[PDB]
Amino acid sequence: SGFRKMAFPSGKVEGCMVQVTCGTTTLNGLWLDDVVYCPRHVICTSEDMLNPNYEDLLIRKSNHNFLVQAGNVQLRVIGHSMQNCVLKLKVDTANPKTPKYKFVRIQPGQTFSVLACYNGSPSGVYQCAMRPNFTIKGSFLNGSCGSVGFNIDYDCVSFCYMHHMELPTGVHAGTDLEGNFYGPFVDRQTAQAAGTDTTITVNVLAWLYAAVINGDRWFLNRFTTTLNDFNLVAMKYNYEPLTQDHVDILGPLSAQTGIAVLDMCASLKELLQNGMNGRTILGSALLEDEFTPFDVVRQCSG
Amino acid sequence: SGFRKMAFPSGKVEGCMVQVTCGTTTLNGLWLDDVVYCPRHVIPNYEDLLIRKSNHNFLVQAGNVQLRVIGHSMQNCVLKLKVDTANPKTPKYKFVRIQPGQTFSVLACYNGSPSGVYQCAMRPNFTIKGSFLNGSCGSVGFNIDYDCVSFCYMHHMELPTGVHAGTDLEGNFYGPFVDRQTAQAAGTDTTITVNVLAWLYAAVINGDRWFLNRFTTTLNDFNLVAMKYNYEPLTQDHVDILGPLSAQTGIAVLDMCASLKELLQNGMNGRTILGSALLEDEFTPFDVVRQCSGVTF
Numbered sequence: 192s193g194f195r196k197m198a199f200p201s202g203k204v205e206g207c208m209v210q211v212t213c214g215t216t217t218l219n220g221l222w223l224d225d226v227v228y229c230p231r232h233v234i235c236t237s238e239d240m241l242n243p244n245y246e247d248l249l250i251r252k253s254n255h256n257f258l259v260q261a262g263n264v265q266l267r268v269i270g271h272s273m274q275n276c277v278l279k280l281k282v283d284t285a286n287p288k289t290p291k292y293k294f295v296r297i298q299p300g301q302t303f304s305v306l307a308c309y310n311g312s313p314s315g316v317y318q319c320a321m322r323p324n325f326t327i328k329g330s331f332l333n334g335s336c337g338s339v340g341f342n343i344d345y346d347c348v349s350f351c352y353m354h355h356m357e358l359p360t361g362v363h364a365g366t367d368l369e370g371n372f373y374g375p376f377v378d379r380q381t382a383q384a385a386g387t388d389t390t391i392t393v394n395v396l397a398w399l400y401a402a403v404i405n406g407d408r409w410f411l412n413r414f415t416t417t418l419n420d421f422n423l424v425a426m427k428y429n430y431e432p433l434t435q436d437h438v439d440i441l442g443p444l445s446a447q448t449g450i451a452v453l454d455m456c457a458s459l460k461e462l463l464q465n466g467m468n469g470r471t472i473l474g475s476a477l478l479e480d481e482f483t484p485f486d487v488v489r490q491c492s493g
Numbered sequence: 494s495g496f497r498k499m500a501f502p503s504g505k506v507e508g509c510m511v512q513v514t515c516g517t518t519t520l521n522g523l524w525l526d527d528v529v530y531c532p533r534h535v536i537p538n539y540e541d542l543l544i545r546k547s548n549h550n551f552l553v554q555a556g557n558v559q560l561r562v563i564g565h566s567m568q569n570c571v572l573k574l575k576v577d578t579a580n581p582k583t584p585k586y587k588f589v590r591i592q593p594g595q596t597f598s599v600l601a602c603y604n605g606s607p608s609g610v611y612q613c614a615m616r617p618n619f620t621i622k623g624s625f626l627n628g629s630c631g632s633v634g635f636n637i638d639y640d641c642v643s644f645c646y647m648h649h650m651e652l653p654t655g656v657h658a659g660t661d662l663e664g665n666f667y668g669p670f671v672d673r674q675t676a677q678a679a680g681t682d683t684t685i686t687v688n689v690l691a692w693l694y695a696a697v698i699n700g701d702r703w704f705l706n707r708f709t710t711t712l713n714d715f716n717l718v719a720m721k722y723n724y725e726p727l728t729q730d731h732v733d734i735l736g737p738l739s740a741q742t743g744i745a746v747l748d749m750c751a752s753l754k755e756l757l758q759n760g761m762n763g764r765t766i767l768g769s770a771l772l773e774d775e776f777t778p779f780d781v782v783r784q785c786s787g788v789t790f
């Protein structure tokens with residue numbers, strides 16, 4: 192029993208965290224095999240942040256301009272290339288701690304663990320979700336650039352996020368490990384704003400199923416709903432539209448608890464109308480949306 | 494910016510997780526140097542049950558490597574299994590017993606394999622509100638102090654309310670619990686007052702000031718109110734511990750206490766503090782400083 196916000200064990204990722212210095216800028220890199228991946232904004236100066244030409248800045252750099260530190264060991268850069276917003280630094284040593292890994296691009300609503308690092312040193316691990324507006328609500332200070340998001344399903348680390356910047360609202364923007372940003376963001380100091388955030392409906396329903404599995408049924412009702420009627424109500428509370436794919440994804444949890452997805456949708460509709468009335472669901476007074484259907488099954492079974 | 498429930502990097506502890514099998518029971522062990530520590534319930538008169546066991550009855554597995562047991566001893570509710578091989582991945586470590594209100598990271602394991610890491614606090618009732626299924630017994634709680642892992646918890650059991658009970662690494666239980674299937678209940682829980690205040694300072698640091706007021710309070714008046722809401726008494730030591738956060742935000746500890754006093758009597762009124770509609774009590778004053786300054790391990 193119990194439901195906690197749970198992160199994947201960070202060990203396999205800690206073994207890949209290095210410090211990358213270019214000029215005055217110092218951030219984190221991901222050392223996998225003989226490549227160190229880091230945000231390309233490490234090559235930017237003070238006046239090269241509003242409108243930087245990264246191809247122009249990178250052509251002026253040599254291998255010895257990039258200082259890479261793995262613990263107390265200075266790694267030798269033997270090549271450099273840029274792939275979208277990520278800088279790939281070829282090094283003369285393959286990381287012996289390189290785990291089995293994949294580069295995966297995630298969709299909004301997906302969750303992942305973040306190993307927050309400063310100067311190539313891991314300081315903390317937390318779980319978070321890709322928000323529907325493509326931002327993440329992380330805990331990041333200056334120097335956290337290059338910190339990574341991942342999932343460790345089985346023995347393979349799926350890298351899905353590299354932290355790049357903080358938006359004016361305190362939310363964070365970054366890229367997949369191929370340098371492609373999530374959302375309409377660019378790696379420049381220009382006026383950028385996160386789109387209006389919405390609640391990840393499929394995740395709230397999954398978390399309501401997790402509560403049913405843990406013996407919490409106070410919120411259940413005798414009603415069901417059509418998918419269209421649920422979406423008309425959900426939209427009014429800034430909830431993401433629930434698609435047929437989401438209903439199908441919730442199938443195993445529906446079978447395990449005996450509560451049809453559209454029946455749980457009716458509980459959610461009612462919670463949205465009434466609030467909690469001093470009650471909590473899984474120790475929370477708000478509807479939690481950062482647990483996917485896959486997370487609920489994993490935590491409530493193995 | 495941002496405030497998350499953050500755990501210590503679990504890497505140093507992952508290298509120590511092994512699987513311990515005795516008869517039909519399989520749980521986790523902590524392999525430090527040439528000793529594997531695990532709950533004694535893996536084997537009730539525990540001295541009588543242990544005297545009937547031989548070294549070869551305990552199967553210890555480190556990944557796909559069987560560790561041979563060369564000795565066994567019991568220290569309170571922990572079984573110490575002497576192994577032939579010293580763990581090469583043994584970090585710098587200490588065994589520390591924590592106080593209720595202190596936080597730590599839990600590396601949940603099933604069959605000697607780490608599956609998740611989460612942060613939690615030792616409740617004032619000595620239980621942890623964890624997340625554990627069958628096979629999690631032997632999972633450990635820890636803090637990281639520079640490069641030294643302070644082991645503070647070993648998971649033993651789940652109470653009927655879904656909360657958890659365990660011991661320090663010397664086998665001494667946290668709370669009035671015993672390691673057997675019997676009628677055991679967690680005491681009435683209380684809110685960790687010093688941690689709520691620290692989390693209110695973390696909210697101020699993140700730009701959340703709606704709950705601040707012009708008022709202050711005496712420590713005695715605050716404790717008379719806090720006792721009415723099932724909050725732990727705030728001591729002078731707590732006030733002193735909150736000193737750096739008070740200096741950093743310019744809000745005196747007793748001034749923040751009057752904000753907590755108004756929050757207890759009046760509620761949040763549809764508002765949230767750090768994305769929460771409840772007062773969070775599982776972040777200590779040190780956790781807030783560490784997360785709002787950036788300490789690395």
Ligand SMILES: CN1CCc2ccc(Cl)cc2[C@@H]1C(=O)Nc1cncc2ccccc12
Pocket residue numbers: 232240331332333334335336355356357363377378379380494
């Ligand atoms: C240092 N510069 C600032 C401007 C800028 C502009 C564009 C880009 Cl692509 C990156 C940056 C980085 C940055 O945002 N760093 C940060 C990343 N995450 C949390 C931060 C918390 C506070 C301060 C900076 C943070």
Ligand SMILES: [Cl-]
Pocket residue numbers: 296297298301
């Ligand atoms: Cl995805």
